[PDB]
C-alpha cells in the first residue's frame, strides 16, 4: 500500500513494499568537547529533480556539499567546526508502465575523482555543484580542471559495472521505481570538517537506456530526497 513518513515539518510518500538497503549492514548512531546533537536537522531535503532522457548519462551528488545550502544542517555545516551525520537517501522515479530503463543508484564512500588533465586536480565546482547534480558524459571529458566524468570509469578509474560493491540499488522501471539507501557515517576519523570532505557521493547511472512508447513522456523525473540521521557536532562549552 502507501506508507507516509514524517520527519520534522516534511512528509514524503513511500510504498509499503519498498526495499531498503542499509549501507554496510550498519544503522547510523551517535559516538556513544561533549558532542552536541541536532534533531532539527533530521528533515527530508528534496533536491531538484533530474530529467532522465533516452540519451542521458548518469549524475552524481556529493552530499556534504549537496546539503551545504539546505537551510538547517547547512547553517550547521557553516557554524560548527566538526560534524558527523548518517544519511537516508531515497531516490524516486516517476514513470508509466510504457517506460523502459534500468538505473544503478549507488552511494560511493570516498569517491576521489580524477581530472581530465592528468597533471592537474579537479576544482571544487567540477567535483560538486551542491544541490545541482553533476552529469556524466558518454565520451571523454576535456578541461584543465574538469573531472574525468566518462561513464565507463565512473570518474574513479574503475569499472562502472563493478560499482555494485558499494551500497547500491537497482531501479528497473518494469519492477521498481524507488531506491532507499541508509548510509551510516563512514570515515577514518570519529568526526571531520564537513565543509571540506565529502564522505560519500550518490551515483545514479542508467545502465539500460530509457525507452518509451510513442506518445509517452520523453523524460522521466528522478527525485532525490535526503534525510540526515544522527547528526551531531562539536559543542562550545567552558572558558
Amino acid at each position: 500500500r502507501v506508507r507516509s513518513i514524517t520527519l520534522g515539518n516534511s512528509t514524503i510518500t513511500t510504498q509499503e513494499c519498498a526495499n531498503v538497503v542499509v549501507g554496510y549492514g550498519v544503522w547510523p548512531t551517535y559516538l556513544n568537547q561533549p558532542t552536541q546533537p541536532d534533531v532539527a536537522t533530521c528533515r527530508f531535503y528534496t533536491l531538484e529533480s533530474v530529467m532522465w532522457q533516452q540519451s542521458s548519462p548518469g549524475w552524481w551528488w556529493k552530499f556534504p556539499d549537496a546539503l551545504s545550502n539546505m537551510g538547517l544542517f547547512g547553517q550547521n555545516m557553516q557554524y560548527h567546526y566538526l560534524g558527523r551525520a548518517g544519511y537516508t537517501v531515497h531516490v524516486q522515479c516517476n514513470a508509466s508502465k510504457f517506460h523502459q530503463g534500468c538505473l544503478l543508484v549507488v552511494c560511493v564512500p570516498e569517491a576521489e575523482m580524477g581530472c581530465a588533465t592528468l597533471a592537474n586536480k579537479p576544482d571544487q565546482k567540477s567535483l560538486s555543484n551542491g544541490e545541482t547534480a553533476n552529469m556524466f558524459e558518454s565520451q571523454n571529458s576535456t578541461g584543465q580542471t574538469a573531472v574525468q566524468a566518462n561513464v565507463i570509469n565512473a570518474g574513479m578509474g574503475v569499472g562502472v559495472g563493478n560499482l555494485t560493491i558499494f551500497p547500491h540499488q537497482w531501479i528497473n522501471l518494469r519492477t521498481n521505481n524507488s531506491a532507499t539507501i541508509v548510509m551510516p557515517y563512514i570515515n577514518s576519523v570519529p568526526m571531520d570538517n564537513m565543509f571540506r570532505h565529502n564522505n560519500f557521493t550518490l551515483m545514479i547511472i542508467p545502465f539500460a537506456p530509457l525507452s518509451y512508447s510513442t506518445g509517452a513522456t520523453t523524460y522521466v523525473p528522478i527525485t532525490v530526497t535526503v534525510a540526515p540521521m544522527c547528526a551531531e557536532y562539536n559543542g562550545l562549552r567552558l572558558a
Binding site: 510504457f98 523502459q100 558518454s138 559495472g161 563493478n162 555494485t164 522501471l173 545502465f207 539500460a208 537506456p209
Partner: protein, 234 residues
C-alpha cells in the same frame, strides 16, 4: 654457553617467512581502533557480490556503457541466439574484468560455482520467452534452438519474471583448476519474440550479473595481469 648448531638456512632472508621483527618505535601508543563500518576479512566477500557482466563486447562498444547491455531485437527469427559466452571467469574477456574475474586473476587456482543473473530491462507490458541454456565443458556450444533445449536449459518467461538466476555447477576433474586458459557455455535463444502493445520503437536490453557461490575458493596468490608499471610512479 648453551651449545648451538649451524642449522642450514640461517642468516638467510627468505622473503616468505614469518619471523618477528624488532620494533623501531616501541613504547609508542597507537591510536585505538574505531568501529568503521565495512570490515572485510576475505576477498570472497568481494567475489560474492554481483557485478554487471559486459557481454556486448563487440568492437567499438567496450568504451561505452553499451557493452553491458545485451540487445533484444524487436523482430528476429525465432530460435536465434541472443548472446553467448564461455564459462571462463578468469580467462574469457566477457567475465574477466568483473569483480569475480578481478579477484580470480589475483590467484592461480580456483574452484566453485558461478552464479549468473539475467535481468530484463524492457517494459512492464512486454512479454516473451528465452532459452537460457548451459553447455557442460567439452560438449560445444549449441548451434540451434533445439540443441539448446535438448540440454540443460530454463524457459525464462519475461512476463512472469524480469530476472533469472542461473547457478553454474562445478564440473572439473581436479579439486581446483587454473584461472588461465574447458569451462562450458551460456547461450540465450529467442524462444518467442518480445510482444508489446504494438506501438513502441526502441529495443529492450538484458543486463547480466556474475557472482561466486558459498563454495568458492582460490589457492595460489600471484600478480594480476592487468596493472603494469615501467618503474616507480614517483
Amino acid at each position: 654457553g648453551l651449545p648451538t648448531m649451524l642449522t642450514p638456512g640461517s642468516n638467510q632472508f627468505l622473503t616468505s617467512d614469518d619471523f618477528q621483527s624488532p620494533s623501531a618505535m616501541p613504547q609508542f601508543d597507537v591510536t585505538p581502533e574505531m568501529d568503521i563500518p565495512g570490515q572485510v576479512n576475505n576477498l570472497m566477500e568481494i567475489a560474492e557480490v554481483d557485478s554487471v557482466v559486459p557481454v556486448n563486447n563487440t568492437e567499438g562498444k567496450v568504451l561505452s556503457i553499451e557493452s553491458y547491455q545485451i540487445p533484444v531485437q524487436s523482430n528476429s527469427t525465432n530460435g536465434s541466439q541472443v548472446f553467448g559466452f564461455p564459462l571462463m571467469p578468469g580467462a574469457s574477456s566477457v567475465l574477466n574484468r568483473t569483480l569475480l574475474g578481478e579477484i580470480l586473476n589475483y590467484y592461480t587456482h580456483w574452484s566453485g560455482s558461478i552464479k549468473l543473473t539475467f535481468m530484463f530491462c524492457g517494459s512492464a507490458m512486454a512479454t516473451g520467452k528465452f532459452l537460457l541454456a548451459y553447455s557442460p565443458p567439452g560438449a560445444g556450444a549449441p548451434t540451434t534452438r533445439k540443441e539448446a533445449m535438448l540440454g540443460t536449459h530454463v524457459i525464462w518467461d519475461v512476463g512472469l519474471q524480469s530476472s533469472c538466476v542461473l547457478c553454474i555447477p562445478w564440473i572439473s576433474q581436479t579439486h581446483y583448476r587454473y584461472v588461465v586458459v574447458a569451462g562450458g557455455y551460456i547461450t540465450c535463444w529467442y524462444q518467442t519474440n518480445i510482444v508489446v502493445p504494438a506501438d513502441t520503437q526502441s529495443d529492450c536490453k538484458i543486463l547480466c550479473f556474475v557472482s561466486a557461490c558459498n563454495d568458492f575458493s582460490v589457492r595460489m596468490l600471484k600478480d594480476t595481469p592487468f596493472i603494469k608499471q615501467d618503474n616507480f610512479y614517483q
